[PDB]
């Protein structure tokens, strides 16, 4: 079942993505590449959810959004790694 999630850059920009809970993290980076041109190998995705419950997790390729219990309108944190600097 397809759902809307958001990806926020360090710039404060929100990227809206249509995803499936079964989508792999690699699929999510592919969708980020489509919207923003950033190559997947340069993307780091963090899921903090709401803070006081679970410790923030670096989303690992091969895992699915389901593994991290990502929900409709959850927000992922995007870190672009370009030439050894985070953006």
């Amino acid at each position: 079942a397809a759902m809307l999630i958001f990806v926020k850059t360090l710039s404060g920009k929100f990227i809206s993505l249509e995803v499936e809970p079964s989508d792999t993290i690699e699929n999510v980076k592919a969708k980020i590449q489509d919207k923003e041109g950033i190559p997947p190998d340069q993307q780091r995705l963090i899921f903090a959810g709401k803070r006081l419950s679970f410790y923030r997790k670096q989303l690992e390729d091969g895992r699915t959004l389901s593994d991290y219990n990502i929900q409709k309108h959850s927000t992922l944190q995007l870190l672009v790694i370009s030439r050894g600097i985070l953006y």
């Binding site: 079942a1 759902m3 958001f6 929100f14 809970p21 709401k50 803070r51 006081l52 419950s53 679970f54 410790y55 997790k57 690992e60 895992r63 389901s66 593994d67 991290y68 219990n69 929900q71 409709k72 309108h73 927000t75």
Partner: protein, 316 residues
């Protein structure tokens, strides 16, 4: 040979302080000392650490409570922490509680459930549903001991929509009064924690289909056997703020909240830095001060100081 639990931890250049607080959480230490963990180790968990954080922790605790040592050098445990959390400073307790939980999570194949808002349903019904959904994916000794439930109320400033959810927690981070006060009761920080706050970090309103600086109000709905309370004294470098050294007066005995009554069992202290701990030893009932390898007797009257950073409370 020494009294079990009266065991320091060598400095290896928050970790020792956090271990001493967890070491002196009796139901956690008893679970490991009674070998209840081996059958619950979770090796495949996508969110876990292959069982290695809980294994390394259990072996450390067995050493600290064997009575054979006055202090141990926790190199093996620090190695596993470095392997799964290379970023390690004051967030280590959150990492450990989460890591212990997933390494011991009894749910070996987790279902995915689409969580939902209250949608006008009664608090009791939505909360029971939230906790049932939590336990479908999270069932461990750490849930048993530490996890509670918030009521979260978000209110969109533009359309005035109210969105209520019930959300699990495994510790509380309490704000202190700003501007800085010299003295505040812990009850006042709890009241501040449950006070409405406009988000700076906006929230997506599903009605406006925009991200809005809604107001968020937290309420304590369900409380755990052991409540971990973090006092928010610090701030990121950019704010250029001195650490708040307010005297937060917290109860040694009989902290009352939401109908439960709590007694202090450990305190992590931070000196602006260096961390130490006070803890109550479960076998003689006395208070002790843990400063890395050194363990010494303490008195209750020493415990409330401006250095108190994390408080561990056990339900009466």
């Amino acid at each position: 040979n020494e009294q079990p639990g009266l065991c320091g931890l060598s400095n290896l250049g928050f970790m020792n302080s956090a271990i001493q607080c967890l070491s002196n959480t009796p139901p956690l230490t008893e679970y490991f000392l009674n070998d209840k963990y081996q059958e619950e180790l979770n090796f495949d968990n996508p969110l876990g650490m292959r069982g290695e954080i809980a294994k390394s922790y259990a072996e450390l605790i067995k050493q600290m409570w064997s009575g054979k040592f006055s202090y141990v050098t926790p190199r093996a445990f620090k190695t596993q922490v470095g392997r799964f959390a290379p970023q390690f400073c004051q967030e280590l307790l959150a990492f450990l509680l989460d890591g212990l939980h997933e390494d011991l999570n009894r749910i070996r194949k987790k279902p995915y459930i689409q969580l939902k808002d209250a949608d006008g349903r009664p608090d009791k019904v939505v909360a029971e549903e939230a906790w049932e959904n939590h336990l479908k994916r999270n069932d461990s000794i750490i849930v048993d001991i530490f996890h509670g439930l918030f009521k979260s109320t978000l209110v969109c400033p533009e359309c005035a929509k109210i969105s209520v959810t019930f959300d699990p927690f495994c510790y509380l981070t309490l704000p202190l009064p700003m501007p800085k006060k010299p003295f505040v009761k812990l009850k006042d920080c709890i009241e501040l924690f449950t006070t409405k706050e406009k988000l700076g970090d906006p929230w997506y309103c599903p009605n406006c289909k925009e991200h809005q600086q809604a107001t968020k109000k937290l309420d304590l709905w369900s409380l755990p056997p052991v409540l971990v309370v973090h006092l928010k004294r610090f701030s990121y470098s950019r704010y250029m703020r001195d650490k708040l050294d307010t005297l937060v007066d917290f109860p040694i005995n009989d902290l009352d909240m939401s109908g439960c009554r709590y007694n202090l069992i450990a305190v992590s202290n931070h000196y602006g830095g260096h961390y130490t701990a006070f803890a109550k030893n479960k076998d003689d009932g006395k208070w002790y001060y843990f400063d890395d390898s050194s363990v010494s007797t303490a008195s209750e009257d020493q415990i409330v100081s401006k250095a108190a950073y994390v408080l561990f409370y056990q339900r009466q």
